[PDB]
């Protein structure tokens, strides 16, 4: 009788991290789950040590962040670890979603649906975080994204002013955004546990999409060691960015203090918002543009209802493989357009890419699955 197996706390650890039956089988694309956890605690830890010196008043917010970067012993690594960890958080998110899409992991309805909430929550958290240093991108970021609510008919204006604290972005806006940005990662952490709880009910999917109970291996030592290696690659990727190119993924305009009278000429999102940004502005309509933005991420919840194929994974589905990569490349296209001004070639090709995004998921990928069924006499 084992202490590891029967102690009411260690029970939980053992049935999640040690004795948990896992496929013999799962590739590097399965490393991103633990990497998201590492990202979560990295952002929690640095974010805590930034909160120790940050002040959330408009007069002083920019000054406190630069006080961190110049005066605070090693405040610069903490600040840019945080900044680049947020981008690392997004690289891992996108890899993790794409893995799920490819391998048919969305057939775990609860795990997947909680995952969609986790994406939206981490997006809202990181929007808030960018508002905090009170640069130019902070202010107009806060302006535009809060104003998305103003598209809700009849009550949208009241709602925007309700979260602002008044008629404009102001003193009241920044102090609550610090408070909202502090708590939300812990709420995320709690939802990450429920995500894992629903997952353990089935165990993991694998590259083949075929049930792997015939060949399970213990999580320890195999996926404990594969996870350590994967994390050490995540540390490389992060520490390359903070130590050799700290500002590569950010905006120079956020190094000028916020200014309510001038929006900059060049303004774009943070790289990881660029596809959704490109989708919304491809529509010359207020209500439709924001409805498309909401639909661009909420679509993931329809993907299980649109699975036509008699196989789970895309591994043995070449038509679907092609159309998956068309989806990735189209998403890469949309982040390129997001980066460009609203002028001649870019308006049309961004409109066509927007249409293709929705056509691929809604129509073209379900039809590919039926054709593939018919070709196998299924």
């Amino acid at each position: 009788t084992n202490i590891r197996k029967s102690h009411p706390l260690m029970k939980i650890v053992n049935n999640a991290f040690i004795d948990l039956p896992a496929p013999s089988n799962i590739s590097s694309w399965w490393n991103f789950g633990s990497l998201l956890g590492i990202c979560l605690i990295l952002q929690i830890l640095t974010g805590l040590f930034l909160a120790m010196h940050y002040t959330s008043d408009t007069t002083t917010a920019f000054s406190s962040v630069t006080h961190i970067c110049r005066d605070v012993n090693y405040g610069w690594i903490i600040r840019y670890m945080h900044a680049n960890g947020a981008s690392m958080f997004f690289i891992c998110l996108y890899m993790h979603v794409g893995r799920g899409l490819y391998y048919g992991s969305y057939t775990f309805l609860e795990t997947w649906n909680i995952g969609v909430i986790l994406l939206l929550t981490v997006m809202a958290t990181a929007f808030m975080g960018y508002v905090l240093p009170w640069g130019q991108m902070s202010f107009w970021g806060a302006t535009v994204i809060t104003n998305l609510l103003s598209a809700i008919p009849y009550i949208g204006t009241n709602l925007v002013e309700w979260i602002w604290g008044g008629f404009s972005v102001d003193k009241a806006t920044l102090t609550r955004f610090f408070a909202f940005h502090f708590i939300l990662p812990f709420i995320i952490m709690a939802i990450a546990m429920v995500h894992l709880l629903f997952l353990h009910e089935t165990g993991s999917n694998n590259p083949t999409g075929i049930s792997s109970d015939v060949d399970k291996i213990p999580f320890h030592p195999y996926y404990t060691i594969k996870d350590i290696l994967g994390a050490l690659l995540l540390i490389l990727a992060l520490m390359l960015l903070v130590l050799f190119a700290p500002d590569l993924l950010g905006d120079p305009d956020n190094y000028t203090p916020a200014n309510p009278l001038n929006t900059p000429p060049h303004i774009k999102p943070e790289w990881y918002f660029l596809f959704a940004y490109a989708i919304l502005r491809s529509i010359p309509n207020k209500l439709g543009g924001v409805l498309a933005l909401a639909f661009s991420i909420l679509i993931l919840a329809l993907i299980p209802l649109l699975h036509t194929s008699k196989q789970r994974s895309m591994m043995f589905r070449p038509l679907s493989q092609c159309l998956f990569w068309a989806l990735v490349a189209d998403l890469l296209t949309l982040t390129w357009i997001g980066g460009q001004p609203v002028e001649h070639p870019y308006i049309t090709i961004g409109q066509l890419a927007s249409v293709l995004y929705f056509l691929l998921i809604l129509v073209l990928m379900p039809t590919a699955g039926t054709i593939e069924n018919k070709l196998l006499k299924w």
Binding site: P21, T202, G203, T333, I349
Partner: protein, 75 residues
């Protein structure tokens, strides 16, 4: 809630394993490794690459077209 001893039913399958201390971590690492990656690449290139060249062509054309459009000539 799944445990070893309760997963599924398997009959008539023998597994031979060796100790980690009996065997090499990198058994024939380049001699067999390189032939494999090339084989894996060949298997997937036609599925992965053609959307990204299709991105590349629309990128190259789009940047070029935008550049040319903000020049004049006879006016």
């Amino acid at each position: 809630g799944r445990q070893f001893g309760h997963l599924t039913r398997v009959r008539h399958v023998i597994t031979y394993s060796l100790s980690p201390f009996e065997q090499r971590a990198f058994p024939h690492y380049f001699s067999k490794g390189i032939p494999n990656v090339l084989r894996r690449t060949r298997a997937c290139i036609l599925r992965v690459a053609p959307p990204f060249v299709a991105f590349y062509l629309v990128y190259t054309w789009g940047t070029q077209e935008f550049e040319k459009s903000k020049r004049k000539n006879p006016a």
